[model samples]
Target: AITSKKIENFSDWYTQVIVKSELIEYYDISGCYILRPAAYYIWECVQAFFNKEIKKLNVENSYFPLFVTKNKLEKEKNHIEGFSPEVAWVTKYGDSNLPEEIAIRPTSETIMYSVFPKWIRSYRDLPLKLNQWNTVVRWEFKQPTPFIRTREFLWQEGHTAHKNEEEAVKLVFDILDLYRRWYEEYLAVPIIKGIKSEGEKFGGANFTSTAEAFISENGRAIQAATSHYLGTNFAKMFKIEFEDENEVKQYVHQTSWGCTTRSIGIMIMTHGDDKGLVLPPNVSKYKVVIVPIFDENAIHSYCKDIEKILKNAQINCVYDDRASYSPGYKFNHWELRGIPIRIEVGPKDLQNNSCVIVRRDNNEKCNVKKESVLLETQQMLVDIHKNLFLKAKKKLDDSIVQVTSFSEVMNALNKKKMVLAPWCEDIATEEEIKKETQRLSLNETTLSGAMKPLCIPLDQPPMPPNMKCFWSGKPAKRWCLFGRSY
Candidate 1:
């Protein structure tokens, strides 16, 4: 039996549940972990949905080399400087010394742009959109936390080159909105869409747009995904120019965006409870699991028939007919794995030509006639998703605190709430607020002495004439979310 309590020991409970559910396994190498079938299936679902969405915009998929030359990576100073320490290098080939040390591509900006010059010649080639599904290595030195901050992880990166800044900027938010939908609709996790401040934006981007999510247990924000506008920086560095319709040579405006396995971590933290993992139905690998009570042939046959009916109706389900495991044990096993619906068929149920359906989100049970099992199961899965989303949304809505002063910010943070306050939108003043939050000894907690601006939300209330900045006391520009983050 699992003993860790989510409310009392979040860290330990998370570790235990992930391993017990067989979602991940510890690898021989530190900072790396194996994604079991249960976890990879969820990733595949995400990939399938995103691929279909991007294809509608005529974005084609392509592949790039894994290794990037040192010179090419260093061509863009700001970009390389940001990821310099984390870049993994290959110094030797087999037993021989390599002519030049190569980097293992912390990102593909330089690698892809190096060849962009050869691909573009005129306005016809202005918008080159390519996306790749692959894994990247970062060589993180901090303690590894599974999907959240691993040394190596899986992700999809999309790169695009446009003729003007207008198209490029539109592409940025289009993908950002898609990411928000991925979190809220599919994973049942709520998020705030906004722009990053100067200090927090991507290293080589003109501007960065992001989908930020809050972790209630730890009172920290997680960057779910990001899309960036490069603004001809990479095009100029790589000399990717095109001749306009008027026969004028101009550099292409670029955008790059990505979402990684970190989203998986956010989903788990948002929904998992003391019982076990609670997965949203949209991404659940097995939407329903049927457990027959006894080894009798009739019961097994009925369960198999039900499985066939659900499968033919396009429902993902499984029938647990193992005679080795008891029915009670089977129920606990499937519940721990977070299957959305569980169907139980015992002697009594079969006698009445009915089955008991259990919902994983709340463990509520309902009895349905045999003829209506398929319909009831489908409806219950839909209800489970809604229930999970509403529960998580309520937590998110309740955790946000609106404040008007620096002292109020400290009090809200001390209570483990997200702070929403007025700001002058000055980078210097944001830095001051961060330092001040660190100086105050509010409480001894794991996330104490760490605070930063999450983002300037897209939906902010209008600033009043007499309003002032929360920290600098200057005229207010807009309201922003500031908090400690993961």
Candidate 2:
């Protein structure tokens, strides 16, 4: 049974839904989790889609070591400063303390950048694009929320170098678009593509582009993914240089971008309801689950026939024929597992040469002729993705409340609504917003009600000519989205 309701206790509901769905299993290590096949299948689907797309963009796949020496970690100081405290170290080999203490990678920039110099010497080696799918450890002391904030988690880090600044800069947004499509198309979660505030941009990056997702349940924002333009900063430090076409030596402009397992959690949070998890059709392993509604002693060919037609249509589906569980039991089981569509073929339906199609997103049911099973499933799968995205898109669109004063910002956030307002774009003003909205609490997820500037959305609302900052009273520059965030 689903013990928590999403509207009542969001944090508890998030945990219970994922755990009961068999997606997450608590591990022995604090702040770590085991992603069961139920959840990892979603990741595999994402990888397949991303790999196919990037390969067309001419990116090659590669892997780097998981350990970096102390010297390497310190090679470029600011790049790892924000990450150093959370880094775990390996001090001994079995019984002896090793002479060099190795650091588990918080991020692979240092580990990979250390070798970038060797891979390039001439102009043709420019625009080198490589990506790796792996896990990274950043032993955070903050309370873990499964995929949201874990000690070690899986992600693909893409690093690319270009001969000039324009290509490097363009690639940043190109990958950011890929992140946006992954969330909007694959996960069916709508997001805003925008620039992170200077204070929130990735360390050592000239600027960062991000896909920001809003969780309507909690009125908080989560960073779905990020793409950073290094602008020759890292190239300068690592000496990732190449001779130009004119035989002049120059440093390369670089970019790095990544998306992680947290995205699965965001999808669940956005679409999961009081009933259980609700998955979009694109990433669901079993897009449809069929249950034969018959007595334990009864046998039937209706289910197998429907399965055959669905399979013949190239749809991913399965039918449960286990007599041990009742039809009621099977329905709940698949619902909790988040199967997109459930088909029921009972004795009556077969008598009518038809079956019932039940949608997981809204529990809407319709009867269709058995011959039309292929067409109905195909269209329903497409509709489910469209509906989930639109429903979430509506909530996100409606939840953004525009404001012009500090009082209104507080009033809007108190009602679990995010505020969009003209801002000075000052880092100090951004810090002030955080301190003002801070709410002390024991629950880690709810501990910080602090509203950070989520982003200055590229799609901005109209601002009056003389608009001023909502908090600082400085002359306004751009419309910034502010909210409490994970």
Candidate 3:
């Protein structure tokens, strides 16, 4: 049972829901977790949807070795510097010490680029696109937060090389748009699409594009996915060069983009309530569940028939016909698991040639004739998704507070709101603002602290004439969202 109120104790509420729903379990190793069947099924659904989209662009899946030699991993100095602290090294083999240290991949840029030079030779091999579905290990010292921050996590990383900067830049945003659709359309969570500031971008990349999501309960901005334009930086380091039509040698322009299981965490935080988990209809493995309320075996037979009918219509469902458990037990069971539709079949419902359908999102019940079950169930699922999306969108919109001064930014954050302020786009000025905000702490209950620039919105409004930057007091250049983050 969920004992914590979502509005009052968000951290506790999240943990409770994640465990009670049986989505994941704590493992013996710190910073590690076990993905149970319920959670893995959701991941499989996401994988299938994204695989279809990438194939349309001619992206093919491939695999790479897990180990990277020290010399090859350090070929890109800036990239290695960024991930060095988190890279786990293997030094011993059985009873003998290894001659050299081997690094477990934090990300595959260095490992993949080590071989790119050998795969391309001329203009015909100019554009090389490949993706891999795998898990990466990043040894984080901070406490793990299940799917959000863990030692090992699953993701799909795509790498592509183009002959020119124009083509590479296009691929960067194309992948970013797909990420935005995955969040807004399928996950029912609206997002803000933008470019990350230099301070927050991936190491050794020219620029990073991302899909940013806001968690209203905590007033935090989470990066949903990222697509980076490498701009010949890694190509130069790894010697990924090719001959052009004129026989001129040039480095290939590259892009790397990825999305991880961290998406599951955002979906849960955005849509779940105090009752338990609330999954979107498209990602849920079992969208409908049927529970019989009658003591007679005849009612069980009727529910089995209804389940068969739903399956025949290509709907995912579960028929709970267990004899030992009471109907109330089954109702709470399915409710906690976040099944979209629940059908109740009692003796009267059968006699009247109808059944009661209860929506999990709103707990609304309606009587539907048996013949209309297939149509009504489909319609109800659609309505439930729309309702959930609207509610979450309002929360995201309401949490954003537009302000002009640094003091106003702090005030907005105190109220558990994300701040949108005009800025000069200076790295030093942003760092100063981070220090100032960190010095002043808020209530212990809130996660508000040092604010970092989340992103510069693609649709940001033009600055007013002579408008000053919020922190630096310089001429404003663009609008930026700032908030605490996980």
Candidate 4:
């Protein structure tokens, strides 16, 4: 394939693939990178999908400033303390010390919630669901990859002030379900939906639920997206209150959900091969690009006719007509750019009024009449998406290893598969496991929360008759997915 072995060394292989494929460029900064066109286009597709879902659910899009003042930010205690370590401070302006230091928005919760109090005044303003498409700065100590853990990355954060805990809780699950569907359908990544272990829940969240997907190479479950049940934590801090039906003032329950650039990394890691990134159809920006193969004899007429045909179809097409590059080079170029399909029109095809369609995924080609090219290309796009999903589903299924012994856990980790093993489900045991493996439990779904304790990292009671902790070897308890992660 692309000279990379079975993804045994995930870090090296991942770095090589993203950079070599021209999807991203490493910047001089420690935890930042330049988003090249291929990666950026993928993000655009993600945004398109997300925007549609949010709007369909009646969530309105809004914008907030990128900087948060110290006074305004300090209103939320947990938000500040949780983010204090990595807060990028703006202490001076134009060679002068500013009156107050500003923190680059690690998240928009504090900044957005400060004004939320004024906007939400009455019961009519309840369930105020607003989403912002923006870039956030989280000064990360972890090593950076293109789309996974960058300091500066694009994401959409949704904040809602609900009238009651019921509405807030429902909103949390609704957004998480949407995330699961979006990830599975559009990104070709299957995920395990669950609540985060208490140690892994979002900072200051009453409870955090998520869609978690394990990387094929490491078996470590990466959080694809999250919906946090804030439970009036931010409302109380920011004083976001509303006059209810009883005309009594009450603080609103709050929730925030987000999908970040990390989702892109999941897509790349899940669907990419040695050849290049294999984007799922729904998120593939250029579904098809028609490349006309020509001789000096028929070049002029062939190029002109193909261009007209593609233009009429309103398809995103490209004519690789440059004499400097060979057809093979052009094919490789487009593949690296993650184009879904390429159409090759040769002199033979021109005479027959047909063209050869090559799929980017498998490089398989089929000859189809020029008249059917557009329709066939569309079908090919759908098939490509299906293929990706099937492959990822298999990976996920194979990666989930059920275990009841410590040796099984070791074997599962070594084999790069997530282990679903019996755990003692105690906070001390979970913390001990965290210290040993440096991996925390993933909390992201209601089922996962019910299976585990809420605030403590204890295992839930055993689901099966005789399951015992892989580590502690106590009587059987609930099974939890365990692995090293990003």
TM-score of each: 0.97, 0.97, 0.98, 0.89
Per-residue lDDT of model 3, residues 106-178, tens digit only: 8999899999999988989978999999999999787678888889999999999999999999999999998
Which residue pairs clash in candidate 1? none
| Regions of model 2 farther than 4 Å from truth | 295-299, 439-445
Instruction: Indicate the residue-level lDDT of 229 in model 1.
Output: 94
lDDT of each: 0.88, 0.89, 0.89, 0.76
Which ranges of candidate 3 are over 4 A from the true structure?
442-448
Model 4 lDDT at residue 140: 68
| Residue 163 of model 2, lDDT score | 94
Q: In lDDT terms, how accurate is model 4? A: 0.76
lDDT of 4 by residue, 191-286 (tens): 877777766777779988877787776555677888999997777787888999999999899899999888888988887776766777676656
